[PDB]
Design a protein around this ligand. Structure first.
Ligand SMILES: *[C@@H]1O[C@H](CO)[C@@H](O)[C@H](O)[C@H]1NC(C)=O
Ligand SMILES: *[C@@H]1O[C@H](CO)[C@@H](O)[C@H](O)[C@H]1NC(C)=O
Lengths: 96, 48
C-alpha cells in the first residue's frame, strides 16, 4: 500500500517502538510514552541517555521495496471441536 | 573510551578488543551518553 500511506513532501504520521523495559507478551499491548532509562539516571525528557521509547515510521512514495509502506492484517482463530459463531457457506439438509 | 586524541572521522580509528571479559559498567561510568542506540543486540542484554 504505497498510495494511502504516502504523499508529496512525506508523511511521518505512523509510529513504532524500539525502547522498552522488557519483552512484549503475546497478544498484549504496551501503548505508553515513557522515556527509556539508560543506567541509573531518572531523566524524563529527550536527548542525552534518556530517549523517547518510540520513533517515527516516516513514509514517502519513493523508497525501496524493503522500505515500502506494507499493510499487514493478521487473522487469529481458536479452532477445536466446539460450538461456532463463524461458519462457511453450506446448506443444512434434513435429519434421518 | 578514555582517550584524549580520538582520531577524526576521516580515519575512524578502530581498535581490536580480544582476550578479555567485556564488562559494560566500565563503559557506562565513563561517558554520560547522548546516543546509545543499538541494532543487533539489546542495550540491556550485553553482559550475558
Ligand atoms: C490488558 O491485557 C490485554 C491482554 O493481555 C493487553 O493487550 C492490554 O494492553 C492490557 N492493558 C493495558 C492497559 O496495557
Ligand atoms: C579518564 O581517567 C581519568 C583517570 O582515571 C579519570 O579522572 C577521568 O574521569 C576518566 N574520564 C573518562 C571520560 O573516562
Amino acid at each position: 500500500s504505497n498510495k494511502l500511506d504516502s504523499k508529496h513532501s512525506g508523511n511521518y504520521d505512523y509510529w513504532y517502538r524500539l525502547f522498552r523495559k522488557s519483552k512484549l507478551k503475546p497478544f498484549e499491548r504496551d501503548i505508553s510514552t515513557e522515556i527509556y532509562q539508560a543506567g541509573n539516571k531518572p531523566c524524563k525528557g529527550k536527548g542525552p541517555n534518556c530517549y523517547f521509547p518510540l520513533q517515527s515510521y516516516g513514509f514517502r512514495p519513493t523508497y525501496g521495496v524493503g522500505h515500502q509502506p506494507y499493510r499487514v492484517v493478521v487473522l487469529s482463530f481458536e479452532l477445536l471441536h466446539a460450538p461456532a459463531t463463524v461458519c462457511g457457506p453450506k446448506k443444512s439438509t434434513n435429519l434421518v | 573510551f578514555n582517550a584524549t586524541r580520538f582520531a577524526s572521522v576521516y580515519a575512524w580509528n578502530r581498535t581490536r578488543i580480544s582476550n578479555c571479559v567485556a564488562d559494560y559498567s566500565v563503559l557506562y561510568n565513563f561517558a554520560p551518553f547522548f546516543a546509545f542506540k543499538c541494532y543487533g543486540v539489546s542495550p540491556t542484554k550485553l553482559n550475558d
